[PDB]
Amino acid sequence: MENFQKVEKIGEGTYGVVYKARNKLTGEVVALKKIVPSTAIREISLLKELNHPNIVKLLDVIHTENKLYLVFEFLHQDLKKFMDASALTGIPLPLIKSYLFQLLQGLAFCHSHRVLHRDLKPQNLLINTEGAIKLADFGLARAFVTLWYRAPEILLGCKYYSTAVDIWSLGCIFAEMVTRRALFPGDSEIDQLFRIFRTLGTPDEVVWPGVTSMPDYKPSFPKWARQDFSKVVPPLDEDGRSLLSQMLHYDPNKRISAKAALAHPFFQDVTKPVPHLRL
Ligand SMILES: O=C(Cc1ccc(N2CCCCC2)cc1)Nc1n[nH]c2ccc(N3CCCS3(=O)=O)cc12
């Protein structure tokens, strides 16, 4: 741990502070997350094995007196900062498609290994000058503030939710890159749920079998009609809107999986363009 030279504070992470640091020994530049229950220890040691080009590599795990340090590979920018930077112009479709395709490959890999992210958002999707995008903070939820990307089943109190929650979050992120505005900017759990309801329609037994039996479901929920989908992400083409609606299906079991999503016609002409970053 004294092998590290804090270069600067990247930002307030979800589990602690994250610093950009230099390994005094190897000289390598990394991201330091200053986060303990032995259960967490075995859980994150398992994440060390979860290696994929679209998953931010966890280089090491350092435990020392209640202090838990996670060393990750460092990327210079996150998707949230990139979106704001191209908010006036907009991220070209080719790049949006490339990014969505890569994240899906990443999710497909994690999910095949029964690992869920559970809290996907623009701030934990990291990019580099090479046109690569990666998932950061994967598996950390299982081990141990925004509700905008939270799947409805979680909001309705489902305690044993599946890999579909990541597909839903990614669907919200996909829509956000296209429109340049968060899809469902909830500022409370009920406001988050109702914003979803107002756009996709209040779910019922017809479209989501068993929904009315969910823990926090209330028969008193207002009944909103589903809105035309062409008003949600204009001017995305039909392939895109088709893929998005399948990523946002209410019923977690009907929601398209990452693997299947990779076969959707929308990615028929997928390429790997590079973004222009001002580091
Ligand atoms: O963030 C970044 C980009 C970045 C780089 C510099 C600043 N700076 C530096 C100081 C000057 C202002 C801009 C702010 C953000 N890179 C990461 N590489 N590896 C990571 C591992 C975890 C995290 N996380 C941080 C919190 C959530 S997380 O996914 O665990 C980030 C990176």
Q: SS3 for the chain, per residue? A: CCCEEEEEEEEECCCCEEEEEEECCCCCEEEEEECCCHHHHHHHHHHCCCCCCCECCEEEEEEECCEEEEEEECCCEEHHHHHHHCCCCCCCHHHHHHHHHHHHHHHHHHHHCCCCCCCCCHHHEEECCCCCEEECCCCHHHHCCCCCCCCHHHHCCCCCCCCHHHHHHHHHHHHHHHHCCCCCCCCCHHHHHHHHHHHHCCCCCCCCCCHHHCCCCCCCCCCCCCCCHHHCCCCCCHHHHHHHHHHCCCCCCCCCCHHHHCCCHHHCCCCCCCCCCCC
Determine whether the shortest distance from the Cβ of 128 to ligand 1 is under 6 A: no
**What resolution (Å)?**
2.3
* Mutation probe of ligand 1 site: the residue of 6, 12, 14, 18 with most atoms within 8 A of C-beta: 18
CA distance to 106, 112, 166, 219, per residue, from 103 (Å): 5, 14, 10, 36
CATH 3.30.200.20 residue window(s) in the chain: 1-76
* Distance from Cα 255 to the centre of ligand 1, integer Å: 31
CATH 1.10.510.10 residue window(s) in the chain: 77-277
On the 0-12 / 13-18 / 19+ scale of CB atoms within 10 A, 271 is: exposed
Determine whether the shortest distance from the Cβ of 120 to ligand 1 is under 6 A: no
Determine whether the shortest distance from the Cβ of 8 to ligand 1 is under 6 A: yes
* Distance from Cα 8 to the centre of ligand 1, integer Å: 10
* Distance from Cα 32 to the centre of ligand 1, integer Å: 9
The listed CATH number (1.10.10.60, 3.20.20.60, 1.10.510.10, 2.70.70.10) that belongs to domain 77-277: 1.10.510.10
CATH topology for the 1-76 domain: Phosphorylase Kinase; domain 1 (3.30.200)
Q: Whose CA is nearest to atom 10 of ligand 1?
A: 10
Atom of ligand 1 nearest to the CA of 124: 29
Q: Whose CA is nearest to atom 13 of ligand 1?
A: 10
Determine whether the shortest distance from the Cβ of 34 to ligand 1 is under 6 A: no
Atom of ligand 1 nearest to the CA of 12: 26
Determine whether the shortest distance from the Cβ of 20 to ligand 1 is under 6 A: yes
Determine whether the shortest distance from the Cβ of 11 to ligand 1 is under 6 A: yes
* Distance from Cα 153 to the centre of ligand 1, integer Å: 30
Answer yes or no: is 102 a known binding residue.
Answer: no
Catalytic status, residue 119: yes
Atom of ligand 1 nearest to the CA of 74: 18
172-177 contact pairs (CB < 8 A, 24+): 172/148, 172/248, 173/79, 173/103, 173/120, 173/121, 173/122, 173/125, 173/149, 174/96, 174/100, 174/244, 174/247, 175/232, 175/233, 175/244, 176/83, 176/122, 177/83, 177/91, 177/96, 177/99, 177/100
